[PDB]
Design a protein around this ligand. Structure first.
Ligand SMILES: C=C1[C@H](O)CC(=C/C=C2\CCC[C@]3(C)/C(=C(\C)CCCC(C)(C)O)CC[C@@H]23)C[C@H]1O
Lengths: 240, 11
């Protein structure tokens, strides 16, 4: 069964996610408006990414053990994982009905063309959509989804990590919780090789991160596009 | 590298 510590860990991460992910998307009204006519969707989508980084941070601070890391390592982990957790957490709004992210209204429904109108190409978008479909298809429990985000953040192999032993230790506690959760609470047939498939998604996220990094470097290098970004996005993803 | 915003949000 799940130990009391494992049950504790899950409860904390569920609550953390609930406190940082508003399924009504009410705060979207505060963003620069979407424009679908250049890079017309960049102001709206940069604000959405900026907002999302803040939420990912609020979630990360609540991960059991994350507080025991130094601020240096906290920074390295958040900076390397931010885009990956945003792509992960975005699965909640993603829908296979029409391959889009549906955040409540037609204004806040983003399709492949919207993403391309933020300065990114199919080199990123096609694998991103394929990621989202394969992730959807796993039909994760919310418990598994929040554990996966947390494991994504506390990855010891991120470049610049100083205390990799401690990061690996925190991650192992989460990974063991997820494996045990799948065994005890996820019924077959759904549970078939589920953990291995979740870890494969973390691998897919690394390739998405690399490609995002490449396209962002190129996008932000043009000072007219970097003007469209936010101070937080620049700090987290880079300022040329 | 200096990450005052990230640092601030991390508390
Ligand atoms: C709150 C939510 C998530 O945090 C974010 C979300 C969707 C995330 C998306 C869909 C549109 C494109 C977007 C924002 C995306 C990009 C346009 C690429 C990053 C753009 C930039 C930072 C400018 O490189 C990465 C994640 C993608 C909706 C909702 O689930």
């Amino acid at each position: 069964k799940l130990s009391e510590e494992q049950q504790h860990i899950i409860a904390i991460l569920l609550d953390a996610h609930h406190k940082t992910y508003d399924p009504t998307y009410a705060d979207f009204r505060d963003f620069r408006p979407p424009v679908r006519m250049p890079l017309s969707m960049l102001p709206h989508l940069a604000d959405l990414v900026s907002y999302s980084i803040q939420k990912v941070i609020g979630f990360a601070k609540m991960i059991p053990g994350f507080r025991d890391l130094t601020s240096d390592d906290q920074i390295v982990l958040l900076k390397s994982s931010a885009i990956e957790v945003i792509m992960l957490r975005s699965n909640q709004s993603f829908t296979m009905d029409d391959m889009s992210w549906d955040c409540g209204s037609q204004d806040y429904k983003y399709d492949v063309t919207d993403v391309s109108k933020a300065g990114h190409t199919l080199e990123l978008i096609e694998p991103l959509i394929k990621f989202q479909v394969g992730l959807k298809k796993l039909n994760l429990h919310e418990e598994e989804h929040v554990l996966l985000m947390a494991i994504c953040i506390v990855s010891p192999d991120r470049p610049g990590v100083q205390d990799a032993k401690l990061v690996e230790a925190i991650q192992d506690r989460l990974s063991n919780t997820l494996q045990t959760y799948i065994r005890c609470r996820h019924p077959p047939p759904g549970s078939h090789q589920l953990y291995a498939k979740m870890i494969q998604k973390l691998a897919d996220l690394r390739s998405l991160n690399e490609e995002h990094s490449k396209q962002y470097r190129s996008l932000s290098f043009q000072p007219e596009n970097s003007m469209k970004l936010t101070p937080l996005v620049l700090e987290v993803f880079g300022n040329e | 590298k200096n990450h005052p915003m990230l640092m601030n949000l991390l508390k």
